[PDB]
Design a protein around this ligand. Structure first.
Ligand code: CA
Ligand code: CA
Ligand code: CA
Ligand code: CA
Lengths: 99, 98
């Protein structure tokens, strides 16, 4: 029932998704991450796009997975004061891409 | 590893039933043993099971209130030795009234 353990699990979900143990996923959520946790969640993407709509950001992070395979992570969030991020959704998608 | 991975899937369902994860889906290809599959689903108030072309979808209901419930869908292929290849897990919120 712990919030830290909860954020650690979310980070692990993303890790497992990038490993392709979780092939694809989506989760609806309402939890507030410290910058350190948010950075841990997203890692080092090869590409990113960030779009703001009505006070909410949806970022799309792309990770080169394998030769034609790409992993894409969408994180929907609200930016809070003291550099906190209220995450509302996370979605992981596979895509075939030209090498 | 795989035992740790299966422990996480079980905990994802747990967090979903607690409503920390409001709703979710995961696409998967992993084989749970009988004990893991039992622990994953926990203690539903009712269950439904359907089969189409050798693929099973079980639907589990967990009552929250008079009107609200959590539903878990698990799609899987039964394997020898009481093992189950899970292909997707989906947690949704449902209500009695429109
Ligand atoms: Ca990571
Ligand atoms: Ca190729
Ligand atoms: Ca190229
Ligand atoms: Ca309605």
């Amino acid at each position: 029932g712990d919030t830290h353990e909860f954020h650690k699990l979310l980070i692990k979900v993303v890790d497992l998704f990038l490993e392709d143990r979780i092939k694809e996923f989506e989760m609806k959520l309402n939890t507030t991450l410290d910058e350190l946790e948010f950075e841990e969640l997203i890692g080092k993407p090869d590409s990113s796009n960030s779009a703001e709509n009505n006070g909410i950001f949806i970022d799309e992070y792309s990770y080169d997975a394998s030769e034609n395979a790409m992993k894409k992570l969408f994180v929907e969030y609200v930016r809070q004061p003291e550099f906190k991020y209220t995450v509302l959704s996370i979605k992981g998608v596979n895509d075939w891409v030209r090498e």
